[PDB]
Amino acid sequence: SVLEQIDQGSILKLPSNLLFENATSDAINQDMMLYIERIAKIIQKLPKRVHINVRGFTDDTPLVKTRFKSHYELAANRAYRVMKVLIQYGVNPNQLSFSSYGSTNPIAPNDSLENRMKNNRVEIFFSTDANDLSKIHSILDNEFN
């Protein structure tokens, strides 16, 4: 459950085991509710303008023992589900959204369970829709360019 930063936002990386019973279903676990709740309470502590996008990923594991037809479908539902819980716990739907990246964005080699839980992680990306820099470039455009 590492936290990573990039120039455009903060990323909260959570493996499959911390949210679901397995990496190939949208079915959640026991400790789920308490952990998501913790993250929900934290989110609640951010500016009311910060956007929170819940992105889901999957390994490249063949879909058999499950019901889904794409790793995109699988990712969408898991992300959807985590987005719903965040809400059930108080986060504002207006600030939320969910996503799916399928299987083509791994974190590492799917050689060891641990790493495979990473590739089926949920990612909570935080950010905003800053447009000043763009607001400025535009103004200057019309006047000078």
Added chain:
Amino acid sequence: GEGSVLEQIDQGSILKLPSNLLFENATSDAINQDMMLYIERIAKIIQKLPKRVHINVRGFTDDTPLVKTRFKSHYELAANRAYRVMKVLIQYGVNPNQLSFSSYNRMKNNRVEIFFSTDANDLSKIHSILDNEFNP
């Protein structure tokens, strides 16, 4: 088409102004009739913009070591020329509190670059906050 273009980068807009059009002789930092109106032109935009914008007037120079004048090395010259530019805008409107100057085919190296930006720190604060309630 009377001045220089607007360049844009992820962190702000750039307005490159060749000194060979701003300043009398390359070895100098004296403004002029041709450049005043355009510095006045620029000054109005800075005024129209949301005061949370800042303006850094930054100076650039070639290699030509022209020591014949008072100025010593390249830095002094930029510093000097970036300052003169950053001052005309003050007498033309732009409130002294948004202006900041600095010093860094050669006609494409001798300019006074106007950098439009802000100090947007929201992503920072977001990470500030998340870093706490998580990691060991």
